[PDB]
Amino acid sequence: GSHMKTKKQQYVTIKGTKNGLTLHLDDACSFDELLDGLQNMLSIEQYTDGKGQKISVHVKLGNRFLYKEQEEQLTELIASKKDLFVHSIDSEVITKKEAQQIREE
Q1: How far is CA 28 from CA 34, 65, 83, 88, in A?
Q2: May I ask which residue range the UniProt record assigns to the signal sequence?
Q3: Where does the chain show beta strands of DSSP type E?
Q4: CB within 8 Å of 75: residues ≥ 6 apart
């Protein structure tokens, strides 16, 4: 029946039906395996909107520190033809460190 709802703290929503891919995750220190899964699935399935595919991946996680490089590598495939409205951004913490990738292992 009718029931008034208050505000939310941590919600998840993914829109990829007749449009591009608009998803918004609002959770910190939590896994987004149920988010990244659909993200890739929908992008491969169909991102054909018809008017203007909105491919805005807004991962408002926080101090979760997601591996952008993991998503970026797959994004590179679309970046070569980023004529659509694609915009992905998270909430990582900038770290000024010399992370030299040198492995003698």
Answers
A1: 14, 9, 31, 17
A2: none
A3: 12-15, 22-25, 54-59, 85-89
A4: 86, 88
3-state secondary structure of 68: helix
Element (H, E) at 15: strand 12-15
Closest CA to 45 of 68, 25, 21: 21
Residue 36 to residue 6: CA distance in whole angstroms: 28
Where are the extended beta strands (E) located within 16-92?
A: 22-25, 54-59, 85-89
Domain count, the chain: 1
- For residue 52, the one-letter residue type is G
Q: What is the bridge-based pairing of β-strands 54-59 and 85-89?
A: parallel
Q: Is residue 81 part of a domain?
A: yes
Method: NMR
Q: How far apart are the first and last CA of the chain?
A: 62
Which tokens is 77 given? Answer: 């495939």
Q: Residues near 78 by Cβ (< 8 Å), separated by ≥ 6?
A: 43, 55, 86
User: H or E stretch including 7?
Assistant: none
Neighbours of 18 (CB within 10 A): 11
